Amino acid sequence: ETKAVGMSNDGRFLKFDIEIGRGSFKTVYKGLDTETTVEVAWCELQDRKLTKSERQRFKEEAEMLKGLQHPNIVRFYDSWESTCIVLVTELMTSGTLKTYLKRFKVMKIKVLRSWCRQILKGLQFLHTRTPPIIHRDLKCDNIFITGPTGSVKIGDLGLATLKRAPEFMAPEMYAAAYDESVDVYAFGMCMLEMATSEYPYSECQNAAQIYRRVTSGVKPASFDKVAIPEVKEIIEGCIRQNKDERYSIKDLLNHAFFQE
Numbered sequence: 001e002t003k004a005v006g007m008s009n010d011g012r013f014l015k016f017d018i019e020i021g022r023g024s025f026k027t028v029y030k031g032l033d034t035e036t037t038v039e040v041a042w043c044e045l046q047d048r049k050l051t052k053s054e055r056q057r058f059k060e061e062a063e064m065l066k067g068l069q070h071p072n073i074v075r076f077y078d079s080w081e082s083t084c085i086v087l088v089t090e091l092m093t094s095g096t097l098k099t100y101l102k103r104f105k106v107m108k109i110k111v112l113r114s115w116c117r118q119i120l121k122g123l124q125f126l127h128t129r130t131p132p133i134i135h136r137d138l139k140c141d142n143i144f145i146t147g148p149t150g151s152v153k154i155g156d157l158g159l160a161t162l163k164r165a166p167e168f169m170a171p172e173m174y175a176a177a178y179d180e181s182v183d184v185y186a187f188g189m190c191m192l193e194m195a196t197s198e199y200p201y202s203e204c205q206n207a208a209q210i211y212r213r214v215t216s217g218v219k220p221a222s223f224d225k226v227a228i229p230e231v232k233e234i235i236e237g238c239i240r241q242n243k244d245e246r247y248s249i250k251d252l253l254n255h256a257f258f259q260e
């Protein structure tokens, strides 16, 4: 009933005073939608002080996000202003994939093949949009376990961007022109800690040490613990330094491992 401590404009989403997860800018409460009767994540972020143009473009982006609809992607219902910004998405109650790994050291090859395949289908869906969507912050903490089946969904598109369709560019500007292969690189690291149950580059203290190891062709210490050679080769092709030498999602789905 209307225990709601927060308000919906049309009267569709009620905010309860039950904090389900606490973060940097994201304070997510437990909500409820009275139309599809689904429990809903009521998320509210710090007030964005944006101009009369960027307050505009957030609106058109929110209705883009409503067009997305994939079984491997957490659904985006609506968003609105209120006093800050409050986002409203499907509620995940089985936790994230990383916490699912924080309790066991070996994942069955069946579950790893199945869940990784569903992640690729999610990434592919985002990349086949017009304009294509690049997640840019893919990790096991942004992948959620859902349902009785135990399927996986990719959420938290906060650091995502649209695929952007000079002469003496500096080296860092050649790196600024990246693309969807940043999600493939992130997929390789996800599949790595799903088969090792160990955070990649845990032996490193900061990103500086991590960057110096990748460009020098030094993989995480945990990479030499992958028991399955076929899995080890897939991760290899995803975390290569040159983006042009990384696997494509189509080839990964057409890999013998994921067609098995």
Ligand SMILES: COc1cccc(-c2cc(-n3cc(CNCC4CCCCC4)c4ccc(F)cc43)ccn2)c1
Binding pocket: 058, 059, 061, 062, 063, 064, 065, 068, 073, 074, 075, 076, 079, 087, 089, 133, 155, 156, 157, 158, 159, 160, 161, 162
């Ligand atoms: C299914 O989608 C989900 C699911 C779960 C969480 C989120 C989410 C989105 C945001 N979020 C971030 C932006 C910034 N612009 C980048 C944006 C531009 C359009 C294409 C996607 C990226 C933004 C703009 C409008 C908006 F309604 C929400 C927005 C912040 C935090 N969680 C989205």
Ligand SMILES: Nc1ncnc2c1ncn2[C@@H]1O[C@H](COP(=O)(O)OP(=O)(O)NP(=O)(O)O)[C@@H](O)[C@H]1O
Binding pocket: 020, 021, 022, 023, 024, 025, 026, 028, 041, 074, 089, 090, 091, 092, 093, 096, 141, 155, 156
């Ligand atoms: N759709 C959702 N349903 C239920 N819980 C969620 C949902 N999205 C996020 N959460 C939880 O809310 C909390 C916020 O975490 P997160 O989304 O990582 O933002 P953050 O903590 O600021 N960034 P990070 O540095 O990546 O942890 C986490 O505990 C999530 O597990």
Ligand SMILES: [Mn+2]
Binding pocket: 141, 142, 156
């Ligand atoms: Mn997150």
Ligand SMILES: [Mn+2]
Binding pocket: 237, 245, 246, 247, 248
């Ligand atoms: Mn290749």
